[PDB]
Structure 1
């Protein structure tokens, strides 16, 4: 009688890893409506509150409505997962659209920040705090150029513990309010994060920066920042005054979301403004660096998952092969692949039996052999996993290219230091690894070299 997610929805495709879980594009089996489902693994994420409190929050968020906040439609739960079913948005992340623009002025910044403050104000009225507000939580509603910003992930932080794994942690330290670090926080922390994002939109650099996560956290905690850089000369006084008010240390003296909406800067500039060319270049650099460290971490992770899943799948099938001749049929292959999912959460794309039948067919319709006869599972295993190895190898490659804006084919030692600082790989550890692959003292690596470093940084 309790509703089953897969009874209602089929998976179309994965949309990536978000905070607390993967997101999958799904479709209602009856009505045909498309949805973006965030699937949270119960094993991998400790809850902060009881079930009663989670349920009550979900019920509230189902009834909330605001143009700058993601719409939530449905909530499911079974033995291992939460399924959070929201509206699909196709505009991508705000910053990925900002990097691909000729001009960007304070008028562009003010319109974006007004949308963010508007969504935030509304949620604070409803006593919902974000805590983790950052640029990848700002999606554009569509590919249209006038598109509304939809803030994602309101509600989650209250109920779920943040990951301390670096794959999940990257990019977060720049944005977290000081009082979150120390444990006594309330809705003002969201003004702080919004202040950091605005600082970044108008200069291209984080106001609190450092060589690794803990050095960023130290800057945040002392709370000092300056507008002394060159690009701050191209910016109105009123913009810096707002930022000062939003990055006020003691939360009770910090400006509220609502009072920020009535600020001179927002009033004036969301109604003869020079472009901010110097900020577009730095944000393009900043985004590129952030995106490649993520891809570096996700690539290392999927290689670790592959090692785990390759050995496990082989063992499962050996048990199944009773006669010991290596011959299993598609139905057994499906049963073996299902069992791998029975004890693993990395394929949130494999939501049910029919997602797995199709995925076996795809592997099978590559290995060439017939799916109505018996099969050599050894072969099947070696192709199934690579459809994540090659798949992930290609996603790293693209971010390497994206990062290499001069198409030089290479990343300097200085740039590696920056990528590995953001990735929290120890300086001595990656230099050590660099030495084992770059024996010419070029002080630069090409893609395959950079890839070899990462395999050596995840025990290969």
Structure 2
């Protein structure tokens, strides 16, 4: 587990749900800010080794529209789930403010809900309470990523203390992946019309409508919305779960494809060349360097540092799922050349873009998942000198400093030999901060 207090100080309360309270916390070394869910062990535990397993699975979710968790720590009283701090508030507030959204704006929002939800399901995670309250805006910035929160805990923990979004089958006690598609459908109905499809004076009347699956597009505002959007909603608000479309099919719907047709332009050329140069250099590093850089980028960077690359990531991510596949990387490189006025055929005079991406894929796809996930993209395409600030190297050092004050050669090896002899420049067995810094610099070096 971990020592929370050594690492973070508590800055303020952010929110309180039924599972625990969410606090703003600050890394004592980096000054970087984080959201922490504090879960009381004794009031809440329902299962601590089974909990650690499932939190591990939550931890490795790597997708732009899913809450990012960095670590789980533990005190004698509590678990501390440390994650990314989002400052845009709930999608719910954006609906109240805007009332309802153009087809273009609704499609862009719901596409991200679809992408995140598709990703969760492929990892055998059902949300169970998908609602605009449980989707946060990354920031107050204009076109920011939305982030799905508040899921994964239900088996491990007991809660303590809305009708609009629940699928009919949840009323019968069932909560399969289709219930999330229903909830997302209710959301889309709301984004486009501003009104819930199953609506009533109170909960009693609402549930009566949910139960029969009866809704319509009778409100006057529906006149001005395409049949494409209606077709999508209808597929999502299908009563029988087995006839209801999957999240993947939602994400692939022609209405979606039409309004999130994001694609590289000339204005993207500077950031695209940056990413490519960093990627080329990344691939040239040895495996040990690549792993430490990936570890460092994904644990220690900020949302503000990844924002240009996230835009590029989106423009390369043709099918809108949260990841880059091989063909997406090939097209991207081709498009990059075209925009620049360069003929891809010039590359022989000594291999094609295809050969190059194929040999790169094993290098960048570090978990062998078949796709380049967000954090693998960021680690490879960022300017890795950004990792070499003193505070970050100090936090990295400290992460591996399990015993006392220095990193044992016997720790570091089981925490990963050829390189170990080199970094230890005085040869006293253990690795101090100075050798650790030099090793990290060597990693960024080439």
Shift of 1:38: 1.4
Unmatched segments (≥5 aa) in structure 1? 166-171, 272-460
Using the alignment, how far apart are the partners of 1:217 and 1:45 within structure 2? 30
96, 110, 115: which one aligns with 1:118: 115
Shift of 1:13: 1.1
Using the alignment, how far apart are the partners of 1:91 and 1:157 within structure 2? 26
1:23-102 equivalences under 5 Å are: 23-42=22-41, 45=44, 47=46, 50-101=47-98
Using the alignment, how far apart are the partners of 1:102 and 1:178 within structure 2? 26
User: Is 1:211 matched up with 2:201?
Assistant: yes
Distance 1:235 1:16, change over 3 A: same
User: Is 1:175 matched up with 2:186?
Assistant: no
1:21-420 equivalences under 5 Å are: 21-42=20-41, 45=44, 47=46, 50-101=47-98, 104-163=101-160, 165=161, 172-271=162-261
Distance 1:158 1:180, change over 3 A: farther
SS at match of 1:150: strand
Residues 161-211 of structure 1 show CA distances to partners (whole Å, capped at 9, x for unaligned) of 454x4xxxxxx2111222222222211111111001111111111111233
SS at match of 1:210: coil
Match of 1:20 in 2: 19
Match of 2:3 in 1: 4
CA contact (8 A) 2:99 2:194 kept: no
Using the alignment, how far apart are the partners of 1:156 and 1:129 within structure 2? 11
SS at match of 1:156: coil
CA contact (8 A) 1:130 1:157 kept: no
Residues 346-384 of structure 1 show CA distances to partners (whole Å, capped at 9, x for unaligned) of xxxxxxxxxxxxxxxxxxxxxxxxxxxxxxxxxxxxxxx
SS at match of 2:164: coil
CA contact (8 A) 2:120 2:126 kept: yes
Using the alignment, how far apart are the partners of 1:101 and 1:205 within structure 2? 12
Match of 1:391 in 2: none
Shift of 1:77: 3.2
Residues 392-417 of structure 1 show CA distances to partners (whole Å, capped at 9, x for unaligned) of xxxxxxxxxxxxxxxxxxxxxxxxxx
Match of 2:298 in 1: none
> Considering only aligned residues, what root-mean-square deviation do their CA atoms show, in Å?
2.1
SS at match of 1:36: strand
Match of 1:373 in 2: none
Distance 1:204 1:98, change over 3 A: closer
Shift of 1:160: 3.5
TM-score by length of 2: 0.55
Distance 1:250 1:64, change over 3 A: same
Using the alignment, how far apart are the partners of 1:181 and 1:80 within structure 2? 35
Unmatched segments (≥5 aa) in structure 2? 262-446
Distance 1:221 1:26, change over 3 A: same
Aligned length: 261
SS at match of 1:193: helix
Distance 1:202 1:64, change over 3 A: same
Using the alignment, how far apart are the partners of 1:184 and 1:99 within structure 2? 30
Distance 1:94 1:152, change over 3 A: same
Using the alignment, how far apart are the partners of 2:164 and 2:159 within structure 1? 15
SS at match of 1:68: coil
Shift of 1:262: 1.3
Shift of 1:23: 1.0
